[PDB]
C-alpha cells in the first residue's frame, strides 16, 4: 500500500543543528502531561489517560489510531509527553561539563 | 480467531495428528486454543461467534515428513503436555558436506 | 465513553463487509482473499521485562543493585530512600502476602498452579470489609 | 543567514496595516528590483484579470450593461482557462456584480485621484472598493484612515469617487 | 564521528556545543538515507531543452 | 484584498513529456496546478499574468523518480484575506449557526454571536432567513462583512466575519 | 498469466495508483489487463544483474 | 540478510551511490516524517485526510 | 549566479567519467521504461538499458551534467559534448 499522499513539499536534509532542549520547548512540544506511573487503567482493557502509554503519544498496535493525528501505526511518528520534575536534576551526561563551568564562573554572581 | 493459514485437516478431536500421517510445510501438528477477553476488536472480523483464539503449533516451513510418534503425558505440575516426532529421510545432494 | 480509535481492514474494491482477509505473515502482507488486493504492508511480527497483570495488576518497579563497579555507600542509601515511598507501601502488603504464600506452598511441595490460584484468591478476596477482623493466617490458609 | 527559532511575530491585522511577512509594503520582484506592494481595488482587479484572459485567448488562437458583460466573461472564462476553475468563475462573477468603475478610463481616473494622499496601498485599494458616503463611514470601515487624512480631504475624495460611478 | 566510537559522548558534546553538521560526508547521508555525494552522486543531472528541440 | 504577487513554484514533469514541446506542457501544468488553487501563505491564486513570459529554469532530474523538477517564476493575481478588513459579498447558505457570505473565491462565516442582538433566525420561512425590524438577510442577499478572524492552512483559508459594527450588514 | 508458481512467472501487479495485487487469490477474476506505467513484480530471470557477496 | 558496514564500504569503493541508497532505504526501513521549518524537530501533527 | 562557471573558462575534463556514464545510462534507461520519447532509431530492441546505450553512442541524450566543485561552484556539460572514450 505505502504511506498516504501529503501536500507538504518533499525535501532533502541539508544540515543537522544539534543542541539542548529548553524546559519551555519541552512543554510546548509536549502533547500530554504524564502524571500517572501506570500503563493501563483498572480494567486492563484500554490505556490510562495521563499514564505512560497515553493514547495521545501515538499507537504501536495495528488496530488502534493515534488520538492526536488519527493515523495508523505505520504513519504516526510518535508524539512526546513531558513530566514536570519536582526539583531540578543533573543530566548524567553533562555533570563533568557542568563541573568545569562551575570552576570557571563565580558561584555567587555567575561572572 | 487468528487461525493460521495452514491446514487443520490432519488433526483429531484431541488436537494431535496420529502417527503415520504425512505432513508438510505450514501443517498444524498440535492444535491448541485459548480463551480471549471481550472488548478487543482487531481488523474487524471479531464477532460474538468468536470466543477462542488459535495457539496452534505448525510444522517448520521448510521441513516435511511423516509423524513418527505422539506421546501425551503430564508435567511436574499436572498440566497436559504432548511431544510429536516427525520422520524424514535426507538423501545426499549438491550442497551436503562430507 | 471514549474516542473510538479503531481500525477495521476492508477491501475498498470488493466492498463486501465483513471481508475475507488473509494474513501472509511470511510475505508481511494483509490481502483480500477474493480479489488479491493488499490492504496493509510492512506488518510487524533482552529489551523488556515480563509481568503477569492478574496477580500484580499495573505496577512497574525496578530494583537497585551492584554493578561491575559500585560503592556500597550509594547502594545502601538509595535502597534506604527507595523504601520510604508512600504510594508503593500499599501494594507491598499484597506482595509480602504473596511471598509468605509462596513460602508455605513451597514447603508443602505443591505445584505452581496451586500457588498461582492461591495468590489470585488472596488478591481478589483482599481489601474488603468482610475480612478485616480475621487473622492473616486464616486468610492464607483459606486461600491455599 | 543565521540561526532561527521562535520569535514573537506581529499578528496580522488590517486595522493596524500589519499585513504579515509576504505582503510587506516593500516587495522584491523576480529581477531583484525593489517595488511597492501592488494592491488592487475590485474594479482594478476586474480589469487586470480579464486583460490577461484575452491575451491568453489570443495566444492559443494564433498558435455594456451588467448581464451581457457577465455572460461574455463567463463564455471567455470557460474557453481560456483549464480545469478546476471553480474559484476563478466565482471571482469573475463576484467582481462584475460589485465593481463601481466599468471601463479603463474610469479606473485610470480613480488611480490618478487617490495617489495624491500618499496612503498605504491597502488603504487606497479599500477606498476604491467600498462605497462610503461620509468621512465617518470611511474612518470606521477603514480604521487605519484615522489620523492619516483630515475629514476635509476625505469628504471631497469620497464625493469625487462617487462622481465617476457609471450607472 | 559518532559512527566510529564513543557515539553518545560525541553526541552530547555536539548538543552542548550546538555543532552544525553540513552532511557532506558519506556517513551523514547513510544515516539520513539519501544519495551520498560520491561516485555517481558527485554531480547533478539536469534536462537540456536546447538539445530537446533539435532532436526532432 | 487583491494583490499582484511574484510567486515561485516547483513543477514536476513525468518523463513522458520530455519532448520538443515540453515548455508548453510546463505552462499547461502551471495553469492547471496553480490557477484556482488556495495557499495559506499567499491566499487564493486566481490568475497568472503574462502567460507568455513565464521564466522556466533548467530542470533537475530526480534521482529515483526520473522526473524533472522545474522551478517556475510567474506573476499572478492573488486574493488574500486579512482580519479587520471589510468586504462585500452575497449570502450563499443560511443555518441556525449563522449565514455564509461569498466574497470572491472565499466564504466568510458569520456566527450568531458576531451578529446584532435584534437579528433572529427564522427557520419557518422558506428559504430560512435572519429577520429584524429593519432588514432581512437571506440567500443571495448582499452583506458588508468585517473579517474578524482568519485561519490559514497550507492549502485552505477559512475566515469568520461580523456585522455588529456600524455601517455593516445589509447593503 | 503463468502465475507465481511457475518460473518464469510473476508474483504481484502494482497499478499506477500504488495498489499492489497478489497474483495468488487474484485468478478468481481472471488474468488482469496491464496498462502502461504499471509494475509487474516478476521472478528474477536469466541475465538479470545481481550483486554477489561473500563476508567478511 | 545483513548488509553490514563492510558491505557498505565496498559499495562506496564501487561508487554505486544509488544502489547504496536503495539497499538502505527501499530494501529496509523507509519512513516519511514531517519536519517544521522553524524547528527541525519531527513534531508536526499531520492530518493527511 | 556566481556559482555557474561560464562555458569559456571551464577547467574540468572534457571526458565523461565512469560514474557519469553509469548514471546517465541509468537515468535515461529509467525514463525510457516510463514511456519517454526515444530520439534514436530502434532496429529491434526492448531493454531500456540497450536503448539508452544506442542513444549514448549516437549522442541523442538530452541531458547535461552539473559537475560540482569543492567550493560550491559548478560547471554544466552536455552529454553530447562530453567525450565517451572509456
Ligand atoms: Zn500520532
Ligand atoms: Zn477485495
Ligand atoms: Zn516547529
Curated annotation (Swiss-Prot), chain C:
Zinc fingers (TFIIB-type) by residue: 7-40
Coiled coil: none
Compartments, record wording: Nucleus
Residues binding Zn(2+): 11, 14, 32, 35
Protein family according to the UniProt entry: Belongs to the TFIIB family.
Miscellaneous comment in the UniProt entry for this protein: Present with 6750 molecules/cell in log phase SD medium.
General function of this protein: General factor that plays a major role in the activation of eukaryotic genes transcribed by RNA polymerase II.
Subunit structure: Associates with TFIID-IIA (DA complex) to form TFIID-IIA-IIB (DAB-complex) which is then recognized by polymerase II.
Protein's UniProt name: Transcription initiation factor IIB
Organism from which the protein derives: Saccharomyces cerevisiae (strain ATCC 204508 / S288c)
Source species taxonomy: Eukaryota, Fungi, Dikarya, Ascomycota, Saccharomycotina
Gene name per UniProt: SUA7
UniProtKB/Swiss-Prot annotation, chain D:
Protein location: Nucleus; Cytoplasm; Cytoplasm, P-body
Record-linked InterPro entries: HRDC-like_sf (IPR010997), RNA_pol_Rpb4/RPC9_core (IPR006590), Rpb4-like (IPR045222), Rpb4/RPC9 (IPR005574), Rpb4/RPC9_sf (IPR038324)
UniProt cross-references to Gene3D superfamilies, sorted A to Z: 1.20.1250.40
Transmembrane segments: none
Keywords: Acetylation, Cytoplasm, DNA-directed RNA polymerase, mRNA processing, Nucleus, Phosphoprotein, Transcription
GO MF assignments: nucleotide binding; translation initiation factor binding
Domain of life: Eukaryota
One Pfam family hit: RNA_pol_Rpb4
Subcellular location, principal: nucleus
One BP annotation, GO: RNA-templated transcription
GO cellular component: cytoplasm; nucleus; P-body; RNA polymerase II, core complex; RPB4-RPB7 complex
Functional note: DNA-dependent RNA polymerase catalyzes the transcription of DNA into RNA using the four ribonucleoside triphosphates as substrates. Component of RNA polymerase II which synthesizes mRNA precursors and many functional non-coding RNAs. Pol II is the central component of the basal RNA polymerase II transcription machinery. It is composed of mobile elements that move relative to each other. RPB4 is part of a subcomplex with RPB7 that binds to a pocket formed by RPB1, RPB2 and RPB6 at the base of the clamp element.
Family: Belongs to the eukaryotic RPB4 RNA polymerase subunit family.
Protein name (Swiss-Prot/TrEMBL): DNA-directed RNA polymerase II subunit RPB4
Taxonomic placement: Eukaryota, Fungi, Dikarya, Ascomycota, Saccharomycotina
Primary gene name: RPB4
Swiss-Prot record, chain E:
Signal sequence range: none
Modification after translation: The tandem 7 residues repeats in the C-terminal domain (CTD) can be highly phosphorylated. The phosphorylation activates Pol II. Phosphorylation occurs mainly at residues 'Ser-2' and 'Ser-5' of the heptapeptide repeat. The phosphorylated form of Pol II appears to carry, on average, one phosphate per repeat. The phosphorylation state is believed to result from the balanced action of site-specific CTD kinases and phosphatases, and a 'CTD code' that specifies the position of Pol II within the transcription cycle has been proposed.
Cell location: Nucleus
Domain notes from UniProt: The C-terminal domain (CTD) serves as a platform for assembly of factors that regulate transcription initiation, elongation, termination and mRNA processing.
UniProt similarity note: Belongs to the RNA polymerase beta' chain family.
Subunit structure: Component of the RNA polymerase II (Pol II) complex consisting of 12 subunits. Interacts with DEF1; the interaction is direct and serves to bridge RPB1 to the Elongin complex in a DNA-damaged dependent manner. Interacts with the Elongin subunit ELA1. Interacts with the Elongin subunit ELC1. Interacts with ASK10. Interacts with ESS1. Interacts with RTT103. Interacts with SHE2.
Protein name as it appears in the record: DNA-directed RNA polymerase II subunit RPB1
Protein source organism: Saccharomyces cerevisiae (strain ATCC 204508 / S288c) (Baker's yeast)
Gene: RPO21
UniProtKB/Swiss-Prot annotation, chain F:
One GO CC term on file: P-body
Gene3D superfamilies: Nucleic acid-binding proteins, RNA polymerase Rpb7-like, N-terminal domain
SUPFAM superfamilies tied to this protein: N-terminal, heterodimerisation domain of RBP7 (RpoE), Nucleic acid-binding proteins
InterPro entries per UniProt: NA-bd_OB-fold, RNA_pol_Rpb7-like_N_sf, Rpb7-like, Rpb7-like_N, S1_domain
Stated name of the protein: DNA-directed RNA polymerase II subunit RPB7
Gene coding for it: RPB7
Other information: Present with 6420 molecules/cell in log phase SD medium.
UniProt cross-references to CDD domains, sorted A to Z: RNAP_II_Rpb7_N, S1_RNAPII_Rpb7
Function statement: DNA-dependent RNA polymerase catalyzes the transcription of DNA into RNA using the four ribonucleoside triphosphates as substrates. Component of RNA polymerase II which synthesizes mRNA precursors and many functional non-coding RNAs. Pol II is the central component of the basal RNA polymerase II transcription machinery. It is composed of mobile elements that move relative to each other. RPB7 is part of a subcomplex with RPB4 that binds to a pocket formed by RPB1, RPB2 and RPB6 at the base of the clamp element.
Signal peptide: none
SMART domains tied to this protein: S1 (SM00316)
One GO MF term: single-stranded DNA binding
Main localization of the protein described in the UniProt heading: nucleus
PANTHER family named in the record: DNA-DIRECTED RNA POLYMERASE II SUBUNIT RPB7, DNA-DIRECTED RNA POLYMERASE II, III
Transmembrane segments: none
Location(s) in or outside the cell: Nucleus; Cytoplasm; Cytoplasm, P-body
Keyword annotations: Cytoplasm, DNA-directed RNA polymerase, Nucleus, Transcription
Family named by the database record: Belongs to the eukaryotic RPB7/RPC8 RNA polymerase subunit family.
Amino acid at each position: 500500500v505505502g504511506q498516504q499522499y501529503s501536500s507538504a513539499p518533499l525535501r532533502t536534509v541539508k544540515e543537522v543543528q544539534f543542541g539542548l532542549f529548553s524546559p519551555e520547548e519541552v512543554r510546548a512540544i509536549s502533547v500530554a502531561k504524564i502524571r500517572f506511573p501506570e500503563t493501563m487503567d483498572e480494567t486492563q482493557t484500554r490505556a490510562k489517560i495521563g499514564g505512560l502509554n497515553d493514547p495521545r503519544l501515538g499507537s504501536i498496535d495495528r488496530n488502534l489510531k493515534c488520538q492526536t493525528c488519527q493515523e495508523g501505526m505505520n504513519e504516526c511518528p510518535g508524539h512526546f509527553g513531558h513530566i514536570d520534575l519536582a526539583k531540578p536534576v543533573f543530566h548524567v551526561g553533562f555533570i563533568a561539563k557542568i563541573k568545569k563551568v562551575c570552576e570557571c564562573v563565580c558561584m555567587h554572581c555567575g561572572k | 480467531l487468528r487461525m493460521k493459514h495452514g491446514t487443520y485437516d490432519k488433526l483429531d478431536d484431541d488436537g494431535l495428528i496420529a502417527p503415520g500421517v504425512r505432513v508438510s510445510g505450514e501443517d498444524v501438528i498440535i492444535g491448541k486454543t485459548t480463551p480471549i477477553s471481550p472488548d478487543e476488536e482487531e481488523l474487524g472480523q471479531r464477532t460474538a461467534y468468536h470466543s477462542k483464539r488459535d495457539a496452534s503449533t505448525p510444522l517448520r516451513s521448510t521441513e516435511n515428513g511423516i509423524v513418527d510418534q505422539v506421546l501425551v503425558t503430564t508435567n511436574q505440575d499436572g498440566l497436559k503436555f504432548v511431544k510429536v516426532r516427525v520422520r524424514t529421510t535426507k538423501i545426499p545432494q549438491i550442497g551436503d558436506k562430507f | 465513553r471514549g474516542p473510538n480509535l479503531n481500525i477495521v481492514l476492508t477491501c475498498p474494491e470488493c466492498k463486501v463487509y465483513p471481508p475475507k482477509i488473509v494474513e501472509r505473515f511470511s510475505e508481511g502482507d494483509v490481502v483480500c482473499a477474493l480479489c488479491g488486493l493488499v490492504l496493509s504492508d510492512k506488518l510487524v511480527d533482552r529489551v523488556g521485562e515480563a509481568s503477569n497483570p492478574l496477580l500484580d495488576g499495573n505496577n512497574l518497579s525496578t530494583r537497585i543493585g551492584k554493578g561491575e563497579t559500585t560503592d556500597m555507600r550509594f547502594t545502601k542509601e538509595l535502597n534506604k530512600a527507595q523504601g520510604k515511598n508512600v504510594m508503593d507501601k500499599k501494594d507491598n502488603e499484597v506482595q509480602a502476602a504473596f511471598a509468605k504464600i509462596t513460602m508455605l506452598c513451597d514447603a508443602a511441595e505443591l505445584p505452581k498452579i496451586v500457588k498461582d490460584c492461591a495468590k489470585e484468591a488472596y488478591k481478589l478476596c483482599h481489601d474488603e470489609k468482610t475480612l478485616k477482623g480475621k487473622s492473616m493466617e486464616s486468610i492464607m490458609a483459606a486461600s491455599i | 543567514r543565521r540561526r532561527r527559532l521562535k520569535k514573537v511575530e506581529e499578528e496580522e491585522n488590517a486595522a493596524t496595516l500589519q499585513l504579515g511577512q509576504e505582503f510587506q509594503l516593500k516587495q522584491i520582484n523576480h529581477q531583484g528590483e525593489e517595488e511597492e506592494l501592488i494592491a488592487l481595488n475590485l474594479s482594478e482587479a476586474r480589469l487586470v484579470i480579464k486583460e490577461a484572459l484575452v491575451e491568453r485567448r489570443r495566444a492559443f488562437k494564433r498558435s455594456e450593461t451588467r448581464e451581457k458583460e457577465l455572460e461574455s466573461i463567463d463564455v471567455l472564462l470557460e474557453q481560456t482557462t483549464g480545469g478546476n476553475n471553480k474559484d476563478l468563475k466565482n471571482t469573475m462573477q463576484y467582481l462584475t456584480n460589485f465593481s463601481r468603475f466599468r471601463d479603463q478610463e474610469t479606473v485610470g481616473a480613480v488611480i490618478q485621484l487617490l495617489k495624491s494622499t500618499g496612503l498605504h496601498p491597502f488603504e487606497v485599494a479599500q477606498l476604491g472598493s467600498l462605497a462610503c458616503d461620509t468621512a465617518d463611514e470611511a474612518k470606521t470601515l477603514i480604521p487605519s484612515l484615522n489620523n492619516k487624512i483630515s475629514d476635509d480631504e476625505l469628504e471631497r475624495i469620497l464625493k469625487e469617487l462617487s462622481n465617476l460611478e457609471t450607472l | 564521528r559518532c559512527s566510529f566510537e564513543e557515539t553518545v559522548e560525541i553526541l552530547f558534546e555536539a548538543g552542548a556545543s550546538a555543532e552544525l553538521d553540513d552532511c557532506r560526508g558519506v556517513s551523514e547521508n547513510v544515516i539520513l538515507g539519501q544519495m551520498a555525494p560520491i561516485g555517481t552522486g558527485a554531480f547533478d543531472v539536469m534536462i537540456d531543452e536546447e538539445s530537446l528541440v533539435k532532436y526532432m | 484584498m487583491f494583490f499582484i504577487k511574484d510567486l515561485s513554484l516547483n513543477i514536476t514533469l513525468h518523463p513522458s513529456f520530455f519532448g520538443p514541446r515540453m515548455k508548453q506542457y510546463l505552462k499547461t501544468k502551471l495553469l492547471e496546478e496553480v490557477e484556482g488553487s488556495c495557499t495559506g501563505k499567499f491566499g487564493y491564486i486566481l490568475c497568472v499574468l503574462d502567460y507568455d513570459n513565464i521564466d522556466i529554469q533548467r530542470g533537475r532530474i530526480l534521482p529515483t523518480d526520473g522526473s524533472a523538477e522545474f522551478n517556475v517564476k510567474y506573476r499572478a493575481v492573488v486574493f488574500k484575506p486579512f482580519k479587520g478588513e471589510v468586504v462585500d459579498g452575497t449570502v450563499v447558505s443560511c443555518s441556525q449557526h449563522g449565514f455564509e457570505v461569498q466574497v470572491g473565491p472565499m466564504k466568510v462565516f458569520v456566527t450568531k454571536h458576531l451578529m446584532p442582538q435584534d437579528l433572529t433566525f427564522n427557520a419557518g420561512s422558506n428559504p430560512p432567513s435572519y429577520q429584524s425590524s429593519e432588514d432581512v438577510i437571506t440567500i443571495k442577499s448582499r452583506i458588508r462583512v468585517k473579517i474578524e478572524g482568519c485561519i490559514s492552512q497550507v492549502s485552505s483559508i477559512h475566515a469568520i466575519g461580523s456585522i455588529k459594527e456600524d455601517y455593516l450588514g445589509a447593503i | 498469466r503463468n502465475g507465481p508458481n511457475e518460473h518464469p512467472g510473476a508474483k504481484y501487479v502494482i497499478r499506477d495508483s500504488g495498489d499492489r495485487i497478489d497474483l495468488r487469490y487474484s485468478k478468481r477474476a481472471g488474468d488482469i489487463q496491464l496498462q502502461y506505467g504499471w509494475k509487474v513484480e516478476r521472478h528474477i530471470m536469466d541475465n538479470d544483474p545481481v550483486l554477489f557477496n561473500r563476508q567478511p | 540478510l545483513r548488509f553490514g558496514e563492510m558491505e557498505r564500504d565496498c559499495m562506496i569503493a564501487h561508487g554505486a551511490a544509488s544502489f547504496l541508497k536503495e539497499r538502505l532505504m527501499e530494501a529496509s526501513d523507509a519512513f516519511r516524517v514531517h519536519i517544521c521549518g522553524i524547528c527541525g524537530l519531527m513534531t508536526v501533527i499531520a492530518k493527511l485526510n | 549566479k556566481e556559482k555557474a562557471i561560464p562555458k569559456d573558462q571551464r577547467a574540468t575534463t572534457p571526458y565523461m567519467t565512469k560514474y557519469e556514464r553509469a548514471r546517465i545510462l541509468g537515468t535515461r534507461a529509467l525514463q525510457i521504461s516510463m514511456n519517454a520519447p526515444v530520439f534514436v532509431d530502434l532496429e529491434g530492441e526492448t531493454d531500456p538499458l540497450r536503448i539508452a546505450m544506442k542513444e549514448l553512442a549516437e549522442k541523442k541524450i538530452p541531458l547535461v551534467i552539473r559537475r560540482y566543485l569543492p567550493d560550491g561552484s559548478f560547471e554544466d556539460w552536455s552529454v553530447e559534448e562530453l567525450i565517451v572514450d572509456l
